[PDB]
Design a protein around this ligand. Sequence first.
Ligand SMILES: C[Si](C)(C)CCCS(=O)(=O)O
Length: 371
Amino acid sequence: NKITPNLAEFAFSLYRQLAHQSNSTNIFFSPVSIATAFAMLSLGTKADTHDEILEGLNFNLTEIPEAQIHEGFQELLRTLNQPDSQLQLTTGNGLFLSEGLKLVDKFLEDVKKLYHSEAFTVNFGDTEEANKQINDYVEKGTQGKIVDLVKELDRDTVFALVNYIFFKGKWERPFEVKDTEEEDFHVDQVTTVKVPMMKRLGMFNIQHSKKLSSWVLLMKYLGNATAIFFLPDEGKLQHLENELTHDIITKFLENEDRRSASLHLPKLSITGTYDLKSVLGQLGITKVFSNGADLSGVTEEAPLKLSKAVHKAVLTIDEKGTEAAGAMFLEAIPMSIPPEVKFNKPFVFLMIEQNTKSPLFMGKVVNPTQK
Ligand SMILES: C[Si](C)(C)CCCS(=O)(=O)O
């Protein structure tokens, strides 16, 4: 897991930027899917264009050889696409290139073989039809969960990147639907809204952190992933966001102790849609989106730049995530008063791949029913 510390720093860099833009919008994105897509794209770039991308993903190119970077991403893709996988993770990356371009076979080989991604040729001379084919690809890739992703292409587009990911996990220890009820969610210190709130009494991997001034809950999904929820103390949301570090997360993941608690956790259906040209440009990735881009690994003779780049991530959290009966189990609950831990005010969360400890998702809920 040589690249996991880098992915974690990329997740935090990207989160802190998005959190700076607006503090009153839900956030949800996939550090892994974005980083994988641009590590892949770098295989078609050279010199400064190439270095900017990998440096913008938090790789210090004076310290880590590039071979270890791509080997880390490929080993990560190997775990996320295992056939027998209950994790049910739907992600894709689509490269849409002008059909008039003479493409380098090596790049198309690396895209398909090394990164198991998709590259298409489109007539960008028909802007509306190209837009439709881009949206149809995403819509088909998500069986209709993500529709009308790209809303506008500029006439001069010759190369577009769409990165999508949809996740609805199945809890190893699920909630009972009968126990879900409408509860208050404190959007601020004097204001509440009603939201569907799951609840369960059980033995949870839960603790209060003095360092983070937050409750920290870890819940495992069927498959190879764990959700980490951070509930900041009154007035500590910003402190929480500032103090998160990869080392702090690792310590939580290594703790397996469980304690009784009465957990209240909102059902969630949230999405995040980001213009990666804008967002990654704030992290230093600019030349690949500019006329000066060195994409000679993609096409040798003609100029090229990445004109459009979008990420959309969709999250569903509910009681079971499936209609099938799960494996039954019994937890031994002591008779002492369980703490009441209610995720009923803004909180942060992170989903981690158990094998690599990579950050599959990161987000913030400011209002579950915001839209
Ligand atoms: C939490 Si409240 C009802 C004062 C703002 C809701 C606006 S929106 O999310 O519907 O855009």
